[PDB]
Amino acid sequence: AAEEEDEVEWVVESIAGFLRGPDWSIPILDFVEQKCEVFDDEEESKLTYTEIHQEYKELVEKLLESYLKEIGINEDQFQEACTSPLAKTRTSQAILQPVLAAEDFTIFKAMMVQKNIEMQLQAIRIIQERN
Amino acid sequence: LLSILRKLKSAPDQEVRILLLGLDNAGKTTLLKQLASEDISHITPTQGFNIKSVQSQGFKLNVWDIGGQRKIRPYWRSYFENTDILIYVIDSADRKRFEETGQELTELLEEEKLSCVPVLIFANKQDLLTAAPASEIAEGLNLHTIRDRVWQIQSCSALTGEGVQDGMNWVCKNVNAKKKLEHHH
Ligand SMILES: Nc1nc2c(ncn2[C@@H]2O[C@H](COP(=O)(O)OP(=O)(O)NP(=O)(O)O)[C@@H](O)[C@H]2O)c(=O)[nH]1
Ligand SMILES: [Mg+2]
């Protein structure tokens, strides 16, 4: 059992490495940048936010599935790793954010609203400079 | 897989997903804001949906308030999956829309993606002298015929707040009702 839990620990660190790396992080960032435009910093959400959250869920499932298959980690191992307290302490809040955003719409919305604020600000700075 | 990811949450078992449904003008957003101790005086018709999280009786109640206009109702089913509790709100004083809301409730309770979900029916706007009693609305809806789930009807006023907590108290005793029934199944 102790050796079996060491293997869980490997699985946790492997998942953590994936969530830190470009294979995961860059498709996520591309999605967030390309879809954040309709997310207004306002209390009430639009019906389209849900449609977009569904695509996000699909992307996340797709990325995770490829990872689990290319690396050779089955679903049961994946679940016992995500269940381990090591999953929380070996990953950071920032690394977990786009992962939690798959199940937690409130987290997803804040992430999209934040990216839209940033990209609008950059668009404004450019207009500011061209005159 | 996506459902495994819930294991990465701070306290995933303390979290309750509540779907708040009903006809346009029933008082859903007003109820939601009362629950969240927010100002209710600048509320307009909901064109999408609101979410508010309320900590109550040892649970985090995540409440999804969906717009009730007819044009929005085809989108209601986008919100059915992973619902723990259904709260259905009725304007007790709009008798002309009782049939419309009776039909929406009936369809919800036949919905496969809401099977085993406990339903609280809030008979709202009881502050109004025109309000039908909950007893009357219960009869009119034939609530006694509801099978394969627990249910409750509660007289309330989202505007005054009266009766609201009594409904929410029922909800809190029934946080595990859905998963207990689907484990039975
Ligand atoms: N007298 C009285 N008026 C109420 C009560 N609850 C809500 N109202 C009023 O009824 C109107 C509709 O309220 P609202 O919360 O917007 O309803 P809704 O169900 O969210 N509508 P929609 O689904 O279109 O967004 C508002 O004028 C609100 O003040 C109540 O208990 N008593
Ligand atoms: Mg509303």
Residue numbers in the entry:
A (entry chain C): 2 to 132
B (entry chain A): 3 to 187
What does the paper say about this structure?
The ciliary protein Arl3 has been shown to act as a specific release factor for myristoylated and farnesylated ciliary cargo molecules by binding to the effectors Unc119 and PDE6δ. Here we describe a newly identified Arl3 binding partner, CCDC104/CFAP36. It recognizes an LLxILxxL motif at the N-terminal amphipathic helix of Arl3, which is crucial for the interaction with the BART-like domain but also for the ciliary localization of Arl3 itself.
The asymmetric unit contained two Arl3∙GppNHp and two BARTL1133 molecules. BARTL1133 displays the same all-helical fold as seen in BART (Zhang et al., 2009). In addition, BARTL1 completely buries the N-terminal helix of Arl3 (area 1). This unconventional binding mode sets it apart from effectors such as PDE6δ or Unc119 and from many other effectors of the Ras superfamily proteins. The hydrophobic side of the N-terminal amphipathic helix of Arl3 is buried in a hydrophobic groove formed by helices α3, α4, α4′, and α5 of BARTL1. The second interface area is formed by switch I, switch II, and residues of the interswitch toggle of Arl3, and on the BARTL1133 side by the loop connecting α2 and α3 as well as parts of the α3 and α6 helices (area 2). There are polar interactions between Thr51B and Tyr81A, switch I main-chain nitrogens of Gln49A and Gly50A with Glu45B and Glu44B of the α2-α3 loop with Lys45A of β2 in the interswitch toggle and Lys35A in the α1 helix.
